[PDB]
Ligand binder design. Sequence first.
Ligand SMILES: [Cl-]
Lengths: 350, 348
Amino acid sequence: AEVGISASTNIPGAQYPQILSGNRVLFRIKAPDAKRVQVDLGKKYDMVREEEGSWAITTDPIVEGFHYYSILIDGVAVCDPASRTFYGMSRMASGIEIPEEGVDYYNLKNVPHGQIRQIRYFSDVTKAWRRAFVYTPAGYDANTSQRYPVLYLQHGGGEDETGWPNQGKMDAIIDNLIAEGKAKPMIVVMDNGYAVDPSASFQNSALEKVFINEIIPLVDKEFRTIADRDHRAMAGLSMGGFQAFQIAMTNLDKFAYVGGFSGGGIQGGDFSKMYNNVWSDVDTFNKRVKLIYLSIGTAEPTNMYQTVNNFHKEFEKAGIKHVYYESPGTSHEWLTWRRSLNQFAELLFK
Amino acid sequence: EEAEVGISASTNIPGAQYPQILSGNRVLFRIKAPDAKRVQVDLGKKYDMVREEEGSWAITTDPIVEGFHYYSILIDGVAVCDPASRTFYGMSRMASGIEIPEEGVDYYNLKNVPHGQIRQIRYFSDVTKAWRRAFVYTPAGYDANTSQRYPVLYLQHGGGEDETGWPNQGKMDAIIDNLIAEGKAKPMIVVMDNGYAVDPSASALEKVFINEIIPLVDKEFRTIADRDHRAMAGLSMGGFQAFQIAMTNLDKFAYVGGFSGGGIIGGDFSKMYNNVWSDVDTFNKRVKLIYLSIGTAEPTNMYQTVNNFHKEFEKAGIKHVYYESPGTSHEWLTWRRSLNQFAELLFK
Ligand SMILES: [Cl-]
């Protein structure tokens, strides 16, 4: 087709890319001297030369949600000049948003809004400056005798602490849930899933030390938190989900809620003994933990699906109580993770 | 002749070796692009890289001036972000940037001092009927000192940039944190918004500031909401906007700053901004501070505009501070220096 709507991820003033009927995407770029121009969106497409040095292609229908993508000039993968950038795939990378019909819980609404703030701290573990983003709920500044539970929320491999604020649209998701009475007012802390102890010789003891010895005490000191395990949760996507289980299950005195979004799991050991025998007494474990949540997209790559799905099945066989969610029609991509946060946050602190 | 090694720039993404800053502040770029026909880097000027053995291209630049520089990689003439570097919103797109340090200069670096916070606030504008976003710096101790109220600086970016400019390119939180911690600047709130506003039914930006941003900040934050505790400043375009908005709303502002911008004009300088300073002597008692800055190395047209604005102020007897930033051009180090100076003068 030809008439379309500019993607919401376009830089201001950029009319292309445009989403056509059927969620095909029309890409254009001016590159008169280029030898090859491709777009990598689900798969690689060669653009075709058009008039006055421009190239264009119309993709197959693109599945609804958020997708990283690249323009390739002569095989060199780069950010599209026409789109915003995100930290993903271990660099700055383009992303494109394909709207869902009749879904708007991750969109901005005229409801009371929280705030995402940037906090900087020097880590003694890593001997480096670090940065976290902290969501506070609407009315935080005025309700000075109110305190709040805290969710610690982590990004995936190749991403960083800007992931949930940007790709994850987390402030809209949480703003809307709280405004509709579906989630309790809560603080959300988004840090970086990488940590290097320079003196040291998906498990990372440095990251665990950073969380337990630095981030949690800092957040509990700078914010009006309810600083106990019944009001503290940890969750993450992919790598961050493995980290959430590793850190929470070896520090159950600090957390009663844990979530893995397309992450978590593992001959594979003696499942009975995972995380230093944390659930070797299943009955006691089930009453220590208020929530274990696992999610996966139905369309994820087979080995990713199997890892989380087999984790789910081991919980069933052992009788470990948990919530299990398959996101219909999505893969190892951010819409799976927005859906997961939406469900998980509704379950927290109840 | 032989190859060299250097220090990876602080703007590199984690693990990325290049660019490296060599001795003399020459910069070494090296990129894998085996199937490309031409690879260039645009940093001050364009350089052609030389294809090496395994499809790697490399070039060493001339000495690069200290400070922050936008740059691009060009593959077959297509200007893109360098995959090796972080990105910034500038030149009306996402673009690479590179930082070249100044030895012994660190007022814009992170120090072990009490730190403020930059927070994101959203609001829906009646003028533009679109969701907008501002970044608001609150000084160290803001949450704990609930009885304290604060003066406010409205701080604007340049043409082709956006509200992320001062937090990122500007390193503004380090600059203000450090001034406050050293007792050189009073504790203050800094508001950074977007310098573009379009009325869909069609100044729109002036109404956004006067009717939306300032009332929103005064309601959401513990501000001292009067002109003696409200300032406005900006760089390039943002400096022109600061003068236009503040000079037509002097009831709202007592301090105004233009960093490489501000000099609207062969006419009657005495009549500018609807005769705001026609009576020079009452103007000088109404305004606490006029600040103008420029880099000595800025393009001639840009230097003359600000310098001539300053000289018109001098002829008319209008009190103001004028600073020429030595050796810097129309680039962010000039504006980091300006904010450092300007914030010291505010609310005193
Ligand atoms: Cl991962």
